[PDB]
């Protein structure tokens, strides 16, 4: 408190949090439940990555 300081840890964290790579895309082939929970995501990500209408394509860009 006694001094404000010259930088904001909040801003530094939030500005880095936008430069970390996207995680990997796993696919469990040992449990049916996880297998489906990942294939659902696979189809959602294809849609989001190839549908012109949305801006999410341009974001994944």
């Amino acid at each position: 408190m006694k001094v404000q300081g010259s930088v904001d840890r909040r801003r530094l964290q939030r500005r880095i949090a936008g430069l970390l790579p996207p995680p990997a895309r796993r696919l469990n082939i040992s449990r049916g439940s996880e297998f489906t929970r990942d294939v659902r995501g696979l189809v959602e990500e294809h849609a989001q990555a190839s549908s012109l209408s949305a801006a999410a394509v341009w974001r994944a860009g």
Binding site: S50, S51, L52, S53, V57, W58, G61
Partner: protein, 50 residues
Amino acid sequence: KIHPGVAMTVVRTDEILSENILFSSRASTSMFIGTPNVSRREARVDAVTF
């Protein structure tokens, strides 16, 4: 300007800019229309093209 012993027949083509009228009857064709889709093509030193 003396006639050589042979005549000649000359051929030309000519181009004409014209306006036109197109008549198409009712319900003449069936158009099937699919969803539009996007894919990236390049990434140059400065910009990204889709």
